[PDB]
């Protein structure tokens, strides 16, 4: 009842970037890995939006750093897609899988290279991203 409802508010707070509302919801027992209907966790929404503080907070609270939404994106896919560098770094220092595949086989490197995020491509390669990784169509990142 309540616990489910704290999850939905945590999702909203993580998306809308309310750094302190997040801290409260957690201490009222909210689930750090609550899912929206698209399968996003709070860490996906915070990584997507570029809220570094909220990303740090969620990880300090046991957030699953390699959680996958219904498309198969991890938070590292989301941060890379939109060029959030410090987020990409922090996710990687907390054990993010650098070669995690979405449902079509795309790594974070695939998405970063697709959208031209060159600084993300470099940081990904420094962290053991595979240059020859293929998606499910046989296509590499380039």
């Amino acid at each position: 009842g309540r616990h489910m409802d704290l999850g939905k508010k945590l999702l909203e707070a993580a998306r809308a970037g309310q750094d302190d509302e997040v801290r409260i919801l957690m201490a009222n027992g909210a689930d750090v890995n609550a899912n929206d209907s698209a399968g996003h966790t709070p860490l996906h929404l915070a990584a997507k939006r570029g809220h570094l503080e909220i990303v740090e907070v969620l990880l300090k609270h046991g957030a699953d750093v390699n959680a996958m939404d219904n498309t198969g994106f991890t938070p590292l896919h989301l941060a890379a897609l939109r060029g959030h560098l410090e987020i990409v770094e922090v996710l990687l220092k907390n054990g993010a899988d650098v070669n995690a595949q979405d449902r079509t086989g795309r790594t974070p490197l695939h998405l970063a290279a697709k959208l031209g995020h060159l600084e993300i491509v470099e940081v990904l390669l420094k962290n053991g991203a595979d240059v020859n990784a293929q998606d499910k169509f046989g296509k590499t990142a380039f």
């Binding site: 698209a38 939404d69 219904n70 498309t71 994106f73 897609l81 079509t104 697709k114 959208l115 998606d135």
Partner: protein, 164 residues
Amino acid sequence: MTEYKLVVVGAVGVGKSALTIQLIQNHFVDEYDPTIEDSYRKQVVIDGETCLLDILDTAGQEEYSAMRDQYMRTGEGFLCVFAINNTKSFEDIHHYREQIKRVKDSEDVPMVLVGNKCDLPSRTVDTKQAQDLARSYGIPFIETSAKTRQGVDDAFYTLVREIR
């Protein structure tokens, strides 16, 4: 059951996400959150048969246009949405259609034209103009409102029938 891979495409702000969340959760989101790429899953009954809808809700924003190829390769059917007070978004159906054809190397890809926001008072895109566009393309045309829920099931269920 049979799984149908449905892809919702169209310009920024036409109601792709609001249509989709109406189908899945039966509620209308008044708030714009720009979509990158979201997947939704629903087990439904269509024409008396149980099936699963695997729905991808896509980015209208042109900054993500390089991701289109990928979802055009994977989708079985495309819900081509415009808003009835958004001339540009109607005109953009052409660009979406052309890319789909090129990626599937085919002129016959399951597709439905969706004129969204039919609850709105004034409109700049004529019903006749849209009916004509759909007849040119040889595809069905459905008028929807994510706000009232009008034509929501009809639109998705119609795309399913086109995949069959």
